[PDB]
Write an enzyme that holds these catalytic residues in place. Structure first.
Site, PDB file in Angstrom:
ATOM      1  N   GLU A  35     -23.957  61.317 -57.950  1.00 39.88           N
ATOM      2  CA  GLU A  35     -23.211  60.096 -57.725  1.00 39.88           C
ATOM      3  C   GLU A  35     -22.864  59.934 -56.254  1.00 39.88           C
ATOM      4  O   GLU A  35     -22.964  58.829 -55.705  1.00 39.88           O
ATOM      5  CB  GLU A  35     -21.934  60.081 -58.577  1.00 39.88           C
ATOM      6  CG  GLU A  35     -22.181  59.928 -60.072  1.00 39.88           C
ATOM      7  CD  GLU A  35     -22.595  58.521 -60.481  1.00 39.88           C
ATOM      8  OE1 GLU A  35     -22.609  57.592 -59.653  1.00 39.88           O
ATOM      9  OE2 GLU A  35     -23.010  58.366 -61.627  1.00 39.88           O
ATOM     10  N   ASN A  46     -21.757  46.921 -56.116  1.00 39.01           N
ATOM     11  CA  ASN A  46     -22.547  46.549 -57.285  1.00 39.01           C
ATOM     12  C   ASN A  46     -22.895  45.073 -57.207  1.00 39.01           C
ATOM     13  O   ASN A  46     -22.257  44.295 -56.493  1.00 39.01           O
ATOM     14  CB  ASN A  46     -21.784  46.818 -58.590  1.00 39.01           C
ATOM     15  CG  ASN A  46     -21.410  48.270 -58.750  1.00 39.01           C
ATOM     16  OD1 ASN A  46     -22.228  49.154 -58.542  1.00 39.01           O
ATOM     17  ND2 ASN A  46     -20.156  48.519 -59.108  1.00 39.01           N
ATOM     18  N   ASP A  48     -22.390  42.682 -59.258  1.00 34.90           N
ATOM     19  CA  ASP A  48     -21.375  41.739 -59.719  1.00 34.90           C
ATOM     20  C   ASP A  48     -20.201  41.612 -58.758  1.00 34.90           C
ATOM     21  O   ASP A  48     -19.236  40.894 -59.076  1.00 34.90           O
ATOM     22  CB  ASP A  48     -20.881  42.135 -61.106  1.00 34.90           C
ATOM     23  CG  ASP A  48     -20.184  43.450 -61.131  1.00 34.90           C
ATOM     24  OD1 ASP A  48     -20.036  44.085 -60.089  1.00 34.90           O
ATOM     25  OD2 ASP A  48     -19.777  43.879 -62.218  1.00 34.90           O
ATOM     26  N   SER A  50     -18.269  44.162 -57.727  1.00 34.79           N
ATOM     27  CA  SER A  50     -17.390  45.307 -57.820  1.00 34.79           C
ATOM     28  C   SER A  50     -17.920  46.413 -56.920  1.00 34.79           C
ATOM     29  O   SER A  50     -19.039  46.328 -56.385  1.00 34.79           O
ATOM     30  CB  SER A  50     -17.280  45.789 -59.269  1.00 34.79           C
ATOM     31  OG  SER A  50     -18.547  46.189 -59.786  1.00 34.79           O
ATOM     32  N   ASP A  52     -17.943  50.907 -56.265  1.00 35.20           N
ATOM     33  CA  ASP A  52     -17.783  52.262 -56.794  1.00 35.20           C
ATOM     34  C   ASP A  52     -17.243  53.146 -55.678  1.00 35.20           C
ATOM     35  O   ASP A  52     -17.752  53.105 -54.553  1.00 35.20           O
ATOM     36  CB  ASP A  52     -19.115  52.834 -57.279  1.00 35.20           C
ATOM     37  CG  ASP A  52     -19.682  52.134 -58.490  1.00 35.20           C
ATOM     38  OD1 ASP A  52     -19.016  51.421 -59.218  1.00 35.20           O
ATOM     39  OD2 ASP A  52     -20.868  52.376 -58.762  1.00 35.20           O
ATOM     40  N   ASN A  59     -15.545  52.724 -60.752  1.00 35.38           N
ATOM     41  CA  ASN A  59     -15.825  51.300 -60.549  1.00 35.38           C
ATOM     42  C   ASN A  59     -14.556  50.451 -60.567  1.00 35.38           C
ATOM     43  O   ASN A  59     -13.734  50.548 -61.486  1.00 35.38           O
ATOM     44  CB  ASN A  59     -16.787  50.861 -61.653  1.00 35.38           C
ATOM     45  CG  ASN A  59     -17.425  49.528 -61.409  1.00 35.38           C
ATOM     46  OD1 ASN A  59     -16.970  48.754 -60.620  1.00 35.38           O
ATOM     47  ND2 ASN A  59     -18.523  49.262 -62.123  1.00 35.38           N
ATOM     48  N   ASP A 101     -12.711  57.464 -73.307  1.00 32.41           N
ATOM     49  CA  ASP A 101     -12.641  56.090 -73.793  1.00 32.41           C
ATOM     50  C   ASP A 101     -13.682  55.773 -74.854  1.00 32.41           C
ATOM     51  O   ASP A 101     -13.810  54.605 -75.251  1.00 32.41           O
ATOM     52  CB  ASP A 101     -12.749  55.108 -72.621  1.00 32.41           C
ATOM     53  CG  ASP A 101     -14.169  54.880 -72.163  1.00 32.41           C
ATOM     54  OD1 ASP A 101     -15.095  55.532 -72.678  1.00 32.41           O
ATOM     55  OD2 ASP A 101     -14.361  54.022 -71.253  1.00 32.41           O
TER      56      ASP A 101
END
Ligand SMILES: [Cl-]
Ligand SMILES: [Cl-]
Ligand SMILES: [Cl-]
Ligand SMILES: [Cl-]
Ligand SMILES: [Cl-]
Ligand code: NA
Length: 129
Positions: A35, A46, A48, A50, A52, A59, A101
């Protein structure tokens, strides 16, 4: 801060990630390698809009506030900049919420594509833990 492999393994172990939700320590070291290349200051944008952040590339669409991701959530209740610190505490605590989650470590695309199903114990081989 750019961690060494065994240095990061030991820090993650001290913070309770070894076998957290059933994921052995090598899974977490492998994820961080692919990562962020073990670099706490890593950022990536990203499509969209957003971003990281940090050693585990968390994110801003869901997990932290960076003030520039409209309509997003802040489920770890932190500014995203806190995830870039040399102290990995904030990243680890937020990662614990993510992995809990329902989807496990599949949330980390690099884990799913480069670590899942491999011999992840190799990532902590030779380390004094
Ligand atoms: Cl390495
Ligand atoms: Cl392991
Ligand atoms: Cl925002
Ligand atoms: Cl620490
Ligand atoms: Cl799981
Ligand atoms: Na956000």
């Amino acid at each position: 801060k750019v961690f060494g492999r065994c240095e990061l393994a030991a820090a993650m172990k001290r913070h309770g990630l070894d076998n957290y939700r059933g994921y052995s320590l090598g899974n977490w070291v492998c994820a961080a390698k692919f990562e962020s290349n073990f670099n706490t200051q890593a950022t990536n944008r990203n499509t969209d809009g957003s971003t990281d952040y940090g050693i585990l590339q968390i994110n801003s669409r869901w997990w932290c506030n960076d003030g520039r991701t409209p309509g997003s959530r802040n489920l770890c209740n932190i500014p995203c900049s806190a995830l870039l610190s040399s102290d990995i505490t904030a990243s680890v605590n937020c990662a614990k919420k993510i992995v809990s989650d329902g989807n496990g470590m599949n949330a980390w695309v690099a884990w799913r594509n480069r670590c899942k199903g491999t011999d992840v114990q190799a990532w902590i081989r030779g380390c004094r833990l």
